[PDB]
Structure 1
Amino acid sequence: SGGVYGGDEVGALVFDIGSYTVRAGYAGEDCPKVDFPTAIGMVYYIDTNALRVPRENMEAISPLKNGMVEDWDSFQAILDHTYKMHVKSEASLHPVLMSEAPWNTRAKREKLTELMFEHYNIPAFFLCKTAVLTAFANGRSTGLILDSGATHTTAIPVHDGYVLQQGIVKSPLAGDFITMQCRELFQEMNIELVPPYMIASKEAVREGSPANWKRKEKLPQVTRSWHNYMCNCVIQDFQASVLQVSDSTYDEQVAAQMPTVHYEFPNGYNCDFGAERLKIPEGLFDPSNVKGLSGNTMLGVSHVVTTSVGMCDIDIRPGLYGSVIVAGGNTLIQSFTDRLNRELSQKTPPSMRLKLIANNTTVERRFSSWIGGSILASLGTFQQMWISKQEYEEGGKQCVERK
């Protein structure tokens, strides 16, 4: 047994581009060695460190709007900076396996392929969907890829490795909503403050008492959008630290009796949220009484999944319900997976097997797309599907029929 048919590893720099955080890394590896914010400090500074140093303007902008790249200049800048700094690998030295959303337009896809084959001259390229990779990451050919990115929640189903484009449900509920609600709650109870970006030093503060600190005399940073991003940073920190998802219909009788939890703001202001820390992660599943939009009509996570299942043929639903694939950042919140499982079980029609893949223990759910991309690249049979430079220079440059 020589294992000649094991697999092949030929470059394939996977670049999973995401609205909250972009990911990258070589194929064959299990975890992406590159993970930094996606928003660039456009005056271009794109790095976990460069994006935290005060300068003249440094306006924050995310090239991907609704998961769709629109500002090609900023996208090219991000790619070039990533390569040069983290990878240090020549552009035209290794292929690329960038990922895309299931709702990528044909014109935008062709433009991405052109940018890949013209300014970088990479030896080969292949653009696979994010849901497909997320499914391959879990070794699943059929299932519901419940993406919960920072700007969209979509239960995309896949059939035999192919995404069902008509089954996607782009629910606005996402991390941005949770962050906005947390910002509103803070502004209601206290004043949201910038991270240490401006705080010179903190002091001891009694729980619930006003905090005292020293202001830095650095640049004013008139750009409010940058201040908004710096505040969203702390908002996301709060969300991932203490914010917890309810486990029931969220009646106002049990939450008042649960244990209390603490949290310290950048300035040292200590406050407890044990009473309403689970009020914000409610619209995700029950968007019926959210204070922000009381007269809205949205579908929760379970509702989105049920709709995505129903909009597709019934012949595949047995393989969709039984292989629900939870992914994305929002899911790492405490009790999120359990609440989702409970809601789907009480909602899903009995006699149909419902199984939630046990992958919430680790934070690898975010990187599921990159893991699936690296897995696909490491395959030997897949080595023929790459869009080589010859196929592009020939004149076709048609990724629709080839993908």
Structure 2
Amino acid sequence: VGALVFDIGSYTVRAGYAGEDCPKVDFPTAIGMVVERGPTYYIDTNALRVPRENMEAISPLKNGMVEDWDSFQAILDHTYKMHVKSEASLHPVLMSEAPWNTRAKREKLTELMFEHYNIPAFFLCKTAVLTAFANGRSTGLILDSGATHTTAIPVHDGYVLQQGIVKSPLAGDFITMQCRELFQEMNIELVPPYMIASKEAVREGSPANWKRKEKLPQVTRSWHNYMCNCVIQDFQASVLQVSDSTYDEQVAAQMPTVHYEFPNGYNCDFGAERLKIPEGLFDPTMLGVSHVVTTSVGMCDIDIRPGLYGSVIVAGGNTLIQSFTDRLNRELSQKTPPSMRLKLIANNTTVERRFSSWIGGSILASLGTFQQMWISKQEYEEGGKQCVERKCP
């Protein structure tokens, strides 16, 4: 009877019920497809795990907004009926759209959600607004760092100021790609687990005794790249770190480090590389994270700037890096006028960062007034899909 909070994340989809404190549903957004020499897709991590011939890795969020409508429906069709199995006709829904979503995309999304799934009520909100609500604020600056799109969204009274949005592509994907390139410097082949089933006490700085699963079919370049990206991302989260000050060849370099064994067992305790890689979004022609934030705040009215300078909220899958918030605080303190008191809200755990938009959707979906502010099925009837524009800000 409760509402469903669907956060279609850049690279991981988050879903769950209105009152739940975390999304019980979560699976990578990437999906596979192949056509008759059928277009049925494969969803969820477990299905994608199985290698298959001419099976791609299609992501319906290339531009942040929904780019592949059939793929987006397929994921929504899968998630509704399998992961959060329940009839669509009975549950009201909350959808988290990107801050800069194109109007036509919103209209098409509403038309699909209503007609195809016949849901009774509906509401579309911006992920930045949901993050601000989740953190417990109506005015602030939300720095989102997901996949392929990092943006600094200033919100005033729960309304996203499109004036001050700065879109930076130095998102999590870029960092992971740099991770691939910095082990072209270590000269280690990137081999995914799905090919590797063997382990041994392989010496440090020594190629491993890895053996392949021989009978698997020839894999597509897309899914192999997708499997390598997952490997480096799992490595990325647990290894990378943001230096407190801009890296300048510390004592030996960074003193002892993590001895993170790759899927092939072998590895060398990563040195300065784990510090250089995260700085890709601090020392990039493009604009750094602090540059993005200052340009965004400097772009909006002076009166609200003190509200933003001091209410800067960080929430994004890429932001979950050690001491990232620390370096951001230092950088923004240096560039902010000293007479302004900057402050970052301590919400650094994985649940508060990654699922922040979903947490906000849960908070909004639970309010008693949510009944009046959504889009009724009757309103869809006599009022066309255009009602999504007026009923959602």
Q: What's the TM-score, normalizing by structure 2?
A: 0.95
- Deviation track 1:269-314 (CA, whole Å, cap 9, x = no partner) reads 2222123221111121221xxxxxxxxx111111100010011011
- Distance in 2 (CA, whole Å) between partners of 1:236 and 1:391 is 44
- Distance in 1 (CA, whole Å) between partners of 2:383 and 2:371 is 22
1:169 Cα offset (Å): 0.3
- Deviation track 1:39-86 (CA, whole Å, cap 9, x = no partner) reads 002271111211101223321010011211111111000011111111
- Distance in 2 (CA, whole Å) between partners of 1:283 and 1:222 is 31
1:22 Cα offset (Å): 0.4
Q: Given that residues 198 and 209 in structure 2 are in contact (C-alpha distance below 8 angstroms), is that contact kept between their aligned partners in structure 1?
A: no
In structure 1, stretches of 5+ residues that fail to align are 1-9, 288-296
1:400 Cα offset (Å): 4.8
Q: Alpha carbons of 1:222 and 1:263: their partners in 2 closer, same or farther (altered >3 Å)?
A: same
Q: Alpha carbons of 1:400 and 1:44: their partners in 2 closer, same or farther (altered >3 Å)?
A: closer
1:381 Cα offset (Å): 2.1
Q: How many residues align?
A: 385
Q: Given that residues 329 and 366 in structure 1 are in contact (C-alpha distance below 8 angstroms), is that contact kept between their aligned partners in structure 2?
A: yes
1:207 Cα offset (Å): 0.9
1:266 lines up with 2:266 in the alignment = no
Q: Given that residues 28 and 375 in structure 1 are in contact (C-alpha distance below 8 angstroms), is that contact kept between their aligned partners in structure 2?
A: yes
- Distance in 1 (CA, whole Å) between partners of 2:174 and 2:107 is 32
1:166 Cα offset (Å): 1.2
- Distance in 1 (CA, whole Å) between partners of 2:247 and 2:366 is 46
1:389 Cα offset (Å): 0.7
1:120 Cα offset (Å): 0.3
- Distance in 2 (CA, whole Å) between partners of 1:53 and 1:255 is 44
Counterpart residue number, 1:31? 22
Q: Given that residues 90 and 120 in structure 2 are in contact (C-alpha distance below 8 angstroms), is that contact kept between their aligned partners in structure 1?
A: yes
1:350 Cα offset (Å): 1.2
1:362 Cα offset (Å): 4.1
Say which is worse superposed, 36-45 or 169-178, in terms of deviation: 36-45
Root-mean-square deviation (CA, aligned residues, Å) is: 1.4
Q: Given that residues 30 and 57 in structure 2 are in contact (C-alpha distance below 8 angstroms), is that contact kept between their aligned partners in structure 1?
A: yes
Q: Alpha carbons of 1:120 and 1:192: their partners in 2 closer, same or farther (altered >3 Å)?
A: same
- Distance in 1 (CA, whole Å) between partners of 2:300 and 2:357 is 23
1:21 lines up with 2:18 in the alignment = no
Q: Given that residues 52 and 219 in structure 2 are in contact (C-alpha distance below 8 angstroms), is that contact kept between their aligned partners in structure 1?
A: no
- Deviation track 1:136-175 (CA, whole Å, cap 9, x = no partner) reads 0011100000001111111100000100011100011111
- Distance in 1 (CA, whole Å) between partners of 2:375 and 2:252 is 55
Q: Given that residues 242 and 324 in structure 2 are in contact (C-alpha distance below 8 angstroms), is that contact kept between their aligned partners in structure 1?
A: yes
1:111 Cα offset (Å): 0.5
1:340 Cα offset (Å): 0.5
Q: Given that residues 51 and 219 in structure 2 are in contact (C-alpha distance below 8 angstroms), is that contact kept between their aligned partners in structure 1?
A: no
1:19 Cα offset (Å): 1.6
- Distance in 1 (CA, whole Å) between partners of 2:341 and 2:156 is 17
- Deviation track 1:97-152 (CA, whole Å, cap 9, x = no partner) reads 01001111111111001001110000011100000100000111000000011111
SS in 2 for 1:125: strand
Q: Given that residues 197 and 210 in structure 2 are in contact (C-alpha distance below 8 angstroms), is that contact kept between their aligned partners in structure 1?
A: yes
- Distance in 1 (CA, whole Å) between partners of 2:28 and 2:350 is 20
Counterpart residue number, 1:292? none
- Distance in 1 (CA, whole Å) between partners of 2:151 and 2:374 is 28
- Distance in 2 (CA, whole Å) between partners of 1:111 and 1:192 is 43
1:382 Cα offset (Å): 2.8
Q: Given that residues 11 and 29 in structure 2 are in contact (C-alpha distance below 8 angstroms), is that contact kept between their aligned partners in structure 1?
A: yes
Q: Given that residues 2 and 91 in structure 2 are in contact (C-alpha distance below 8 angstroms), is that contact kept between their aligned partners in structure 1?
A: yes
1:249 Cα offset (Å): 1.7
- Distance in 2 (CA, whole Å) between partners of 1:29 and 1:283 is 36
SS in 2 for 1:25: strand
Q: Alpha carbons of 1:79 and 1:181: their partners in 2 closer, same or farther (altered >3 Å)?
A: same
1:262 Cα offset (Å): 1.2
- Deviation track 1:208-247 (CA, whole Å, cap 9, x = no partner) reads 1111121111233331111000000011011101111111
| Amino-acid identity (%) | 100
- Distance in 2 (CA, whole Å) between partners of 1:123 and 1:57 is 39
SS in 2 for 1:157: strand
Q: Given that residues 110 and 388 in structure 2 are in contact (C-alpha distance below 8 angstroms), is that contact kept between their aligned partners in structure 1?
A: no
SS in 1 for 2:281: coil
Q: Given that residues 41 and 51 in structure 1 are in contact (C-alpha distance below 8 angstroms), is that contact kept between their aligned partners in structure 2?
A: yes
Say which is worse superposed, 377-386 or 305-314, in terms of deviation: 377-386
Q: Given that residues 135 and 142 in structure 1 are in contact (C-alpha distance below 8 angstroms), is that contact kept between their aligned partners in structure 2?
A: yes
1:401 Cα offset (Å): 4.1
Q: Given that residues 144 and 316 in structure 2 are in contact (C-alpha distance below 8 angstroms), is that contact kept between their aligned partners in structure 1?
A: yes
